[PDB]
């Protein structure tokens, strides 16, 4: 029987108590990245994150960091693939820069070959390490051709310019690839980059934000997670009918979030709680699992959410090989209203939630996650055990699906010197614990759960966040980043997997 | 009677001998910048610029550095318009960044009234300072998604599209603008963007440069240029027909250079001095002037020279009320062989001229101008009786046009520490030689030269360069942006206008 803490202080950072032996001898353990995050912009055409980033600077960081250059993987990937040799690791998650192999975004418009022969090496450099890859086809960064010809995502066209996208990744590295992740995290997208344009594009409503250069945060979230629906089952669609000769399976990256009550007595915060499980998984889960839109969904939002028609909804329902989880943290979940008629209305608020890490008795959800210096009744909390109940409602509530958890993990500030990043022990108790509830729940209920990546590989761009927060296992000097140089949770992550 | 030094040391740099009295009452002083050079990233959509810079860092400049950020007059522009209010210039011309007020480069795709906003209150508050702007419709940084669409102004989809922008121009600022520039340098984008892949968007043939994503060095040049004399001319003729109570004058920029024979009684070196003249002012003032190209021209490159229409030629001949005139310096020319066969012509290649700053006899043109660190037999050195030629020029074979220098300056090393940088006396001596030869033109050959506008304002990102050289009249800290100090050469600058 597994014990799993759920509170400091954890004892699963042993390994003699806890490594790769406890899981089957074919569970995949590596770790993940993304192109923009780092890559740098050295040899590609430009994405709308660039363009985000800098049309934007507050928006990229509080340093105003971007991806410019970032870890300059261009040049260094064989440094990201002596990292994933010296740990030993059997997987590592990386996505193509649709940029970087279709600078003008439409495919007729010819394709860059240097771009090509990049990833090519990558690819051969992994399998030769006897690394396999899983390859992200879109991790946000969308042509800027394609966002400022008909707004990306929120026009219809994207399907078929998507679809030949992938279309030429299949057939470039799908003799090598075998996993391919569709879309990364389905639900960001639409409510950060067309509901409160915390994210590229960064479109939403005036009164929201006055910076944005347009939008509509209560009408554009659902369209645009709609197209990506379609978008991704037209992938999926392409794959099994034109390359399944190539033996590879595909699915969408979800982010999974556990939401618990606020009050656990109080049925306004129960019902709260399953409104939530629904607009935040369900959402995407609904489609692809049943081919429309959970029923809450449709009454809460009424005209403003899409409806499939038979043939779309036929195309999404089981368009998948597998699901990739992204999971990060738990939310306590209480009532709050919907203001469907006020200018500052968003598609967030259609669940009638407010989301918390503290519950109403004052009890902090976990340990600390990541600390807001502007505001500290902002601080994020973890709760290794929301692992476990998310795989264990994805197997009973969605079909049980084979599972890869493609993201886990915790940054640490960029204010701390190197001796400081280098000792990162809440790290290694962030990954440790969730790997202490990701072991019992494939044991105790049998969930499908066929591998782990940590993210990130080495220190990168951080989404809104520059680089004031590091993610990496590995260590890197934004002053000199060609050496990736092994944290102590890279350490302990190493002595994991080869105990 | 007026002399003029063509050596060092120059005595023009005092007042007493040379200031604004010497010229016109009316005649225009000022200083000039651009949108890339001097604004900065934040509010604006994406530019190939933008694209091209981080494609391709080794090409943005040795530093690496690019205009995210660079002086980031999107804030302190009020800064910018205290250094001339301090000079008591009359004259700014700057550049409106297409990116800026139209993100996704169609005009049917939305304005972007915060961008339009920003330019108001900059014609708001040069005009309050008595200060005519010269504003320049285009100055290289093309939207990135009109690259991705069609290869910018490779099709003619961009003759529309520009046509649109402009548009969008006169009838928001045209009641306070009444001098614009159309396009800057015709021909720096064709040559050194479509034909030898040193600029943006960077296209040239693959053993011209193999970093290239497309192109044809060969072709390209010819296909670009002739899109943007059908491009220039269709706002032109917008600006005549529909936006006649404006009251303005609207021309484009010429790059002006002279040209001197290498050998001065080899009649083979001064054949190619005559074709140079030809391939790099010939090529756009002919249309300009006649509605065809040169007949040097017609007759070299046949078949990849594009021809006029009745209707198009009828449209770009005459097509300006002035010409703003670009002038840095002076070569010698010598025959060089045409090799229309080999894979690595260029478009360059079609003089048959091979151009230097030491002529056959070993005598350097003039005094350094620009020292390049890399390679010394590449230093290029600057002519100031070459103001005097290219105007005298102008006058007589181009039927007496009114002009405006609109470019004019000399850069530093970034390499110099603040101290150096304040002191450019090397500035004074360019810029007051050029102008004691300005004066001599103006005078006795009676041209129609009705301003000059010294580049840059303050130091800014350099083209190609970086921050690695200096060309203001004021200084900026990389380090702190905030402050335009003016260095000796601004302060040089001040006594001349106001003496
Ligand atoms: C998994 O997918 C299943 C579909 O493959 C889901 O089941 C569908 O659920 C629909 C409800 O959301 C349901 O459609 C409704 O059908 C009502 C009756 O339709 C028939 O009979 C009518 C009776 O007079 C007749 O007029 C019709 O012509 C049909 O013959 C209909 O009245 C409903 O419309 C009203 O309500 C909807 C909101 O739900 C409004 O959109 C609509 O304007 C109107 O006010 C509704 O019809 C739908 O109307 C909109 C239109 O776009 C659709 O084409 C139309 O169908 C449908 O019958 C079933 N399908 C089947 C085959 O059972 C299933 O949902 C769950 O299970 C059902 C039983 C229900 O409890 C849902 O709430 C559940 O969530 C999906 N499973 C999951 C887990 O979500
Ligand atoms: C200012 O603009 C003027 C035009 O408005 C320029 O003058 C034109 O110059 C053209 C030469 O480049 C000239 O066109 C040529 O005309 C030849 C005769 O055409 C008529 O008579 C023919 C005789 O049999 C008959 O077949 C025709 O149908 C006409 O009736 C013609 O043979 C030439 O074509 C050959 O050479 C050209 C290269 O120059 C090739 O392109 C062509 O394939 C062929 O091998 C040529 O015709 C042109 O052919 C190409 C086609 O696209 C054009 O439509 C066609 O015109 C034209 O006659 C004059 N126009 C007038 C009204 O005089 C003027 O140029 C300068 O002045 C002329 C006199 C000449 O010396 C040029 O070299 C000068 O540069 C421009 N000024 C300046 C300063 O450039
Ligand atoms: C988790 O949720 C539960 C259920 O909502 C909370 O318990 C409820 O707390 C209410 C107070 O917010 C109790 O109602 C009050 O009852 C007193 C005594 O009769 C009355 O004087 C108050 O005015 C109020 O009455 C309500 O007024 C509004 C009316 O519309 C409504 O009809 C009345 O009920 C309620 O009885 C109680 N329910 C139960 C089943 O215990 C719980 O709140 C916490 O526990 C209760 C016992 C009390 O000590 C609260 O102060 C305390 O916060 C909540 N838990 C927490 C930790 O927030
Ligand atoms: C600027 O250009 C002028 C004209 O091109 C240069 O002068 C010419 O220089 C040529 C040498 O490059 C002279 O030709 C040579 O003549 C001698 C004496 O007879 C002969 O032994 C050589 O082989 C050569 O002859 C040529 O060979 C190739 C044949 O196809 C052709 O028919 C022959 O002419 C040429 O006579 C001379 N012309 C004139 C009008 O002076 C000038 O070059 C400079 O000046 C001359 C006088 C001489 O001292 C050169 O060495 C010197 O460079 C050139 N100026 C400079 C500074 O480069
Ligand atoms: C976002 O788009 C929605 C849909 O067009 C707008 O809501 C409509 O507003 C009009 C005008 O007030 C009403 O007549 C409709 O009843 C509304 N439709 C629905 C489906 O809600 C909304 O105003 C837009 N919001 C902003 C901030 O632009
Ligand atoms: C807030 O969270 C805490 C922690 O889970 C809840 O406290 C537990 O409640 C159960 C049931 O009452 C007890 O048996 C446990 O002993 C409690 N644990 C702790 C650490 O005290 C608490 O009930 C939650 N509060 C509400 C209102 O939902
Ligand atoms: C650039 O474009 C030109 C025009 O197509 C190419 O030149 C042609 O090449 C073909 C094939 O060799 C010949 O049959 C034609 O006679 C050429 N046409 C002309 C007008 O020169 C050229 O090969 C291309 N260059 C590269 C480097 O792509
Ligand atoms: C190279 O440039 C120099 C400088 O202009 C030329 O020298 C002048 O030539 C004229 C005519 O021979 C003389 O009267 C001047 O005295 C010369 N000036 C100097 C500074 O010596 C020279 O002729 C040019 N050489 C060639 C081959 O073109
Ligand atoms: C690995 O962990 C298991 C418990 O799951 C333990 O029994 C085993 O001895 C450990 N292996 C090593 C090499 O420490
Ligand atoms: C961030 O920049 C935007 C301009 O795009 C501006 O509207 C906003 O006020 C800035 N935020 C802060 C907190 O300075
Ligand atoms: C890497 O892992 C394999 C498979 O478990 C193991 O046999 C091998 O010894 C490990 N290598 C290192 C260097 O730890
Ligand atoms: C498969 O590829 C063929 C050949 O290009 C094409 O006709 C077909 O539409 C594709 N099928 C899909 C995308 O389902
Ligand atoms: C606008 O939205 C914010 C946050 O959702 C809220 O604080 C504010 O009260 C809203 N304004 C109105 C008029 O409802
Ligand atoms: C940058 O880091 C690498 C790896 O540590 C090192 O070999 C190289 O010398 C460093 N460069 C400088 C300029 O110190
Ligand atoms: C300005 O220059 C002229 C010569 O062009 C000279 O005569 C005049 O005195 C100068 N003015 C001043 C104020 O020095
Ligand atoms: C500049 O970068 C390009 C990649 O875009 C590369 O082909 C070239 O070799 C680099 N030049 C030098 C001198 O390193
Ligand atoms: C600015 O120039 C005008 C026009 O020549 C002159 O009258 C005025 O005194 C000058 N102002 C300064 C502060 O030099
Ligand atoms: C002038 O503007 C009118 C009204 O928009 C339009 O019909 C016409 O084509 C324009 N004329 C030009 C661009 O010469
Ligand atoms: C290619 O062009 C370069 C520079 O124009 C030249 O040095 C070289 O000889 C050319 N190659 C051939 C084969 O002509
Ligand atoms: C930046 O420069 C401005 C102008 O000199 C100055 O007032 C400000 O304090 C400077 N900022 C810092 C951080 O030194
Ligand atoms: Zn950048």
Same mark, same amino acid.
């Given at each position: 029987?597994?014990?799993?803490?759920?509170?400091?202080?954890?004892?699963?950072?042993?390994?003699?108590?806890?490594?790769?032996?406890?899981?089957?001898?074919?569970?995949?353990?590596?770790?993940?990245?993304?192109?923009?995050?780092? /890559?740098?912009?050295?040899?590609?055409?430009?994405?709308?994150?660039?363009?985000?980033?800098?049309?934007?600077?507050?928006?990229?960081?509080?340093?105003?960091?971007?991806? &410019?250059?970032?870890?300059?993987?261009?040049?260094?990937?064989?440094?990201?693939?002596?990292?994933?040799?010296?740990?030993?690791?059997?997987?590592?998650?990386?996505?193509?820069?649709?940029?970087?192999?279709?600078?003008?975004?439409?495919?007729?418009?010819?394709?860059?070959?240097?771009?090509?022969?990049?990833?090519?090496?990558?690819?051969?450099?992994?399998?030769?390490?006897?690394?396999?890859?899983?390859?992200? =086809?879109?991790?946000?960064?969308?042509?800027?051709?394609?966002?400022?010809?008909?707004?990306?995502?929120?026009?219809?066209? *994207?399907?078929? $310019? !998507?679809?030949?996208?992938?279309?030429?990744?299949?057939?470039?590295?799908?003799?090598?690839?075998?996993?391919?992740?569709?879309?990364?995290?389905?639900?960001?997208?639409?409510?950060?980059?067309?509901?409160?344009?915390?994210?590229?594009?960064?479109?939403?409503?005036?009164?929201?934000?006055?910076?944005?250069?347009?939008?509509?945060?209560?009408?554009?979230?659902? +369209?645009?997670?709609?197209?990506?629906?379609?978008?991704?089952?037209?992938?999926?669609?392409?794959?099994?009918?034109?390359?399944?000769?190539?033996?590879?399976?595909?699915?969408?990256?979800?982010?999974?979030?556990? !939401?618990?009550?606020?009050?656990?007595? $109080?049925?306004?915060?129960?019902? @709260?709680?399953?409104?939530?499980?629904?607009?935040?998984?369900?959402?995407?889960?609904?489609?692809?699992?049943?081919?429309?839109?959970?029923?809450?969904? +449709?009454?809460?939002?009424?005209?403003?959410?899409?409806?499939?028609?038979?043939?779309?909804?036929?195309?999404?329902?089981?368009?998948?090989?597998? =699901?990739?989880?992204?999971?990060? !943290?738990?939310?306590?979940?209480?009532?709050?209203?919907?203001?469907?008629?006020?200018?500052?209305?968003?598609?967030?608020? &259609? @669940?009638? @939630?407010?989301?918390?890490?503290?519950?109403?008795?004052?009890?902090?959800?976990?340990?600390?996650?990541?600390?807001?210096?502007?505001?500290?009744?902002?601080?994020?909390?973890?709760?290794?055990?929301?692992?476990?109940?998310?795989?264990?409602?994805?197997?009973?509530?969605?079909?049980?699906?084979? *599972?890869?958890?493609?993201?886990?993990?915790?940054?640490?500030?960029?204010?701390?010197?190197?001796?400081?990043?280098?000792?990162?022990?809440?790290?290694?108790?962030?990954?440790?614990?969730?790997?202490?509830?990701?072991?019992?729940?494939?044991? /105790?209920?049998?969930?499908?759960?066929?591998?782990?990546? @940590?993210?990130? =590989?080495?220190?990168?761009?951080?989404?809104?966040?520059?680089?004031?927060?590091?993610?990496?296992?590995?260590?890197?000097?934004?002053?000199?980043?060609?050496?990736?140089?092994?944290?102590?949770?890279?350490?302990?992550?190493?002595?994991?997997?080869?105990?």
């Amino acid at each position: 029987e597994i014990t799993c803490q759920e509170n400091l202080p954890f004892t699963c950072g042993n390994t003699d108590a806890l490594n790769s032996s406890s899981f089957s001898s074919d569970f995949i353990f590596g770790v993940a990245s993304s192109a923009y995050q780092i /890559e740098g912009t050295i040899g590609r055409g430009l994405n709308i994150w660039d363009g985000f980033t800098h049309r934007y600077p507050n928006k990229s960081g509080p340093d105003h960091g971007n991806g &410019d250059t970032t870890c300059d993987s261009f040049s260094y990937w064989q440094k990201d693939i002596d990292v994933l040799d010296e740990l030993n690791a059997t997987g590592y998650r990386f996505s193509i820069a649709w940029s970087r192999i279709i600078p003008r975004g439409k495919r007729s418009r010819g394709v860059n070959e240097k771009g090509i022969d990049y990833y090519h090496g990558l690819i051969s450099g992994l399998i030769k390490k006897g690394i396999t890859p899983f390859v992200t =086809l879109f991790h946000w960064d969308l042509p800027q051709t394609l966002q400022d010809e008909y707004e990306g995502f929120l026009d219809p066209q *994207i399907i078929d $310019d !998507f679809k030949d996208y992938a279309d030429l990744c299949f057939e470039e590295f799908g003799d090598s690839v075998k996993y391919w992740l569709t879309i990364n995290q389905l639900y960001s997208v639409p409510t950060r980059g067309y509901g409160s344009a915390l994210d590229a594009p960064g479109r939403c409503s005036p009164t929201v934000d006055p910076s944005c250069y347009a939008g509509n945060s209560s009408t554009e979230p659902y +369209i645009v997670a709609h197209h990506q629906l379609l978008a991704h089952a037209k992938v999926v669609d392409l794959y099994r009918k034109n390359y399944t000769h190539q033996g590879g399976k595909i699915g969408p990256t979800m982010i999974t979030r556990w !939401f618990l009550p606020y009050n656990d007595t $109080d049925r306004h915060s129960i019902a @709260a709680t399953e409104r939530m499980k629904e607009f935040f998984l369900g959402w995407f889960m609904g489609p692809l699992t049943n081919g429309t839109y959970p029923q809450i969904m +449709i009454d809460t939002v009424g005209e403003r959410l899409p409806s499939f028609s038979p043939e779309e909804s036929n195309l999404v329902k089981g368009s998948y090989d597998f =699901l990739g989880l992204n999971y990060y !943290f738990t939310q306590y979940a209480q009532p709050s209203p919907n203001p469907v008629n006020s200018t500052n209305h968003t598609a967030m608020m &259609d @669940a009638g @939630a407010k989301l918390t890490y503290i519950n109403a008795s004052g009890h902090y959800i976990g340990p600390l996650f990541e600390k807001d210096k502007a505001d500290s009744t902002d601080n994020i909390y973890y709760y290794p055990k929301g692992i476990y109940s998310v795989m264990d409602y994805f197997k009973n509530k969605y079909y049980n699906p084979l *599972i890869y958890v493609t993201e886990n993990g915790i940054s640490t500030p960029g204010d701390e010197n190197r001796n400081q990043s280098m000792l990162d022990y809440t790290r290694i108790d962030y990954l440790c614990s969730h790997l202490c509830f990701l072991n019992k729940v494939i044991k /105790e209920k049998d969930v499908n759960v066929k591998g782990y990546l @940590a993210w990130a =590989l080495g220190d990168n761009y951080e989404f809104n966040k520059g680089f004031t927060v590091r993610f990496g296992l590995s260590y890197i000097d934004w002053n000199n980043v060609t050496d990736r140089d092994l944290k102590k949770s890279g350490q302990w992550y190493q002595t994991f997997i080869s105990p």
